[PDB]
């Protein structure tokens, strides 16, 4: 899956999300990538976010809509991503699941061009390209 969000020179946000899904998935299985509150959400007054991780778990938590409402509530992109993941961990615990089996992460951007990212588990990277150039960061 690749999810991509951007703020242009006018200060407008937009995003895109694309995948072939889980390899060897059941026929007709759909993940978070085409679902608007789940794989991608953009509000040009607040910010945008895209998800990574197990599609099922992102659908279940409507994660990217949660991230953008936490930025609406007053969190920076970084704080929104972290607080979102921390709620998801508490839900995985409520469902009596082993956290090692679950992976959900987000990258987020707000109107000011501030950005952030966070994941349940380590091993995810994301690329940031602003006027300081293109760089791969780690949540």
């Amino acid at each position: 899956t690749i999810g991509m969000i951007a703020l242009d020179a006018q200060g407008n946000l937009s995003g895109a999300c694309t995948t072939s899904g889980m390899a060897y998935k059941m026929h007709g299985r759909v993940g978070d990538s085409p679902i608007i509150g789940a794989g991608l959400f953009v509000d040009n007054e607040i910010g945008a976010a895209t998800a990574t991780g197990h599609g099922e778990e992102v659908i279940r938590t409507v994660g990217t809509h949660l991230v953008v409402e936490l930025m609406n509530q007053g969190r920076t992109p970084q704080q929104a991503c972290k607080e979102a993941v921390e709620r998801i961990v508490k839900i995985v615990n409520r469902r009596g699941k082993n956290l090692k089996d679950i992976q959900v992460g987000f990258i987020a951007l707000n109107k000011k061009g501030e950005y952030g990212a966070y994941c349940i588990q380590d091993g995810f990277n994301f690329a940031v390209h602003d006027q300081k150039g293109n760089r791969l960061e780690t949540p």
């Binding site: 899956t1 690749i2 999810g3 991509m4 969000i5 951007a6 703020l7 242009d8 020179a9 006018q10 200060g11 407008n12 946000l13 937009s14 995003g15 895109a16 999300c17 694309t18 995948t19 072939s20 899904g21 390899a23 060897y24 998935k25 059941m26 026929h27 007709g28 299985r29 759909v30 993940g31 990538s33 085409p34 679902i35 608007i36 794989g39 991608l40 959400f41 953009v42 509000d43 040009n44 945008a48 895209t50 990574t52 990258i107 951007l109 000011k112 061009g113 501030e114 950005y115 990212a117 995810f124 990277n125 994301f126 690329a127 940031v128 390209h129 602003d130 006027q131 293109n134 791969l136």
Partner: protein, 136 residues
């Protein structure tokens, strides 16, 4: 701090270069994120998006995508086969229909009515690996 693009994973670095070609020239974020991800859908070696994409268990490569602009216009396609560029078909759902999400056959039917044509999205590599998984 604008323009600025973020994308997921390592292929996102190279995706970010295509998106930045739009953004650095003062173009729309919408056209930038579309151009950016298309690179990865187009790449056969990028086995988790578009053309190189590993299939479902029955060996059909089904793709999912959605797009959202600055003013709540959204478009999605899900479980669509044969169209290498689902993000553009999703963009066309958004700009060309009264709907927001089309899935399966109807998504392909729409794609073809908009001028996209059928390609084979299952690479030899992915057919090989699917047939290894079928043994295991």
């Amino acid at each position: 701090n604008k323009p600025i693009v973020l994308s997921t994973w390592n292929f996102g670095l190279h995706a970010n270069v295509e998106a930045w070609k739009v953004l650095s020239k003062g173009g729309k974020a919408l056209d930038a994120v579309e151009k950016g991800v298309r690179l990865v859908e187009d790449d056969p070696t990028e086995r988790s998006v578009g053309y190189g994409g590993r299939p479902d268990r029955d060996g059909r490569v089904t793709l999912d995508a959605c797009i959202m602009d600055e003013n709540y216009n959204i478009g999605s396609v899900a479980c669509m086969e044969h169209i290498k560029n689902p993000i553009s078909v999703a963009r066309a759902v958004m700009e060309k229909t009264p709907h927001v999400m089309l899935v399966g056959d109807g998504a392909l039917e729409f794609a073809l009515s908009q001028g996209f044509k059928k390609e084979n999205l299952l690479t030899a590599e992915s057919e090989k690996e699917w047939k290894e998984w079928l043994k295991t």
